[PDB]
Amino acid sequence: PNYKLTYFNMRGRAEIIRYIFAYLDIQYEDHRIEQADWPEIKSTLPFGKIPILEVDGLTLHQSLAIARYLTKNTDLAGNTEMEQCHVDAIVDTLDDFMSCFPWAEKKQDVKEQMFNELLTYNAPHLMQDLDTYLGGREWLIGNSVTWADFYWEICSTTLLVFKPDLLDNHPRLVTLRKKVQAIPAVANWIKRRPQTKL
């Protein structure tokens, strides 16, 4: 089909979709809107939220729903129904934590305090749980890369902006990031994508 992804000019919640299209070598329109565009665009959306992916004229929404759709019947999905469950579960665990952050908080002092508390008091527990889950394995699930590995690299990239030492006790989680970033199609996307804070 023809694909049109609509999101802000940010990695954010679209980036997982962008990595999947890159890895699979699938062409798509990467439509990046400005804030000034938002009201007009929002009025068309099913639940007033982006990203959305238009597929031959039909709208999909929810970043992870779309990610899962794009990876079905590909080597990124997980090799068994059980492993597909593990992929989903790891992704939702990461997403649950990312959703704790007050990204829309206007009071900058309150926002900063909350970010620093989450990254200092809460994040280390998740990092240890992830490290223990990965153990000595090459990838989070199965014997080959899945979109859970991609989501780890995406989420950790943003977390590292606010907490540079996040992974100083977890070299195995850094190695995993590096392994994702070394995949040629992914490396190419990372190199060429617009440089945005988030």
Ligand X SMILES: N[C@@H](CCC(=O)N[C@@H](CS)C(=O)NCC(=O)O)C(=O)O
The residues annotated as belonging to the active site are 7, 13, 103
Q: Where are the alpha helices (DSSP H) in the chain?
A: 15-24, 38-42, 63-71, 81-98, 108-117, 123-134, 147-162, 171-182, 184-192
Q: Are the CB atoms for 140 and 149 separated by under 8 Å?
A: yes
Provide φ and ψ at 154, rounded to 5°. -65, -50
Does residue 63 touch ligand X according to CB under 6 A? yes
Query: What is the smallest separation between the CB atom of 45 and ligand X, expressed in angstroms?
Result: 8
- Compose the 160-189 pattern: x for residues touching a copy of itself by CB under 8 A, - for all others: ------------------------------
Does residue 105 touch ligand X according to CB under 6 A? no
Does residue 79 touch a copy of itself according to CB under 8 A? no
With CB under 8 A as the contact rule, the residue among 27, 39, 58, 106 that binds a copy of itself is 58
51 binds, among a copy of itself, ligand X, none (CB under 5 to 8 A by kind): ligand X
CA 29, 49, 166, 146 torsion-angle sign: negative
Q: Which residues, 72 to 101, sit near ligand X by CB under 6 A?
A: 92, 96
Name the residue nearer to a copy of itself (CB basis): 96 or 112.
96
Does residue 12 touch ligand X according to CB under 6 A? yes
With CB under 8 A as the contact rule, the residue among 32, 41, 54, 62 that binds a copy of itself is 62
The single residue listed with the structure tokens 């943003």 is 158
Does residue 38 touch a copy of itself according to CB under 8 A? no
Residues in contact with 166: Cβ distance below 8 Å, sequence separation at least 6, in sequence order: 119, 123, 127, 156, 159, 160
Residues in contact with 8: Cβ distance below 8 Å, sequence separation at least 6, in sequence order: 14, 32, 33, 34, 35, 50
Helix H or strand E segment including 33: strand 29-33
Q: Which residues are annotated as a binding site for glutathione?
A: 7, 13, 38, 48-50, 62-63
User: Footprint of a copy of itself on this chain (CB under 8 A)?
Assistant: 46-49, 55, 58, 60-62, 64-66, 68-69, 72, 81-82, 84-86, 88-89, 92-93, 96, 99, 125-126, 129, 132-133
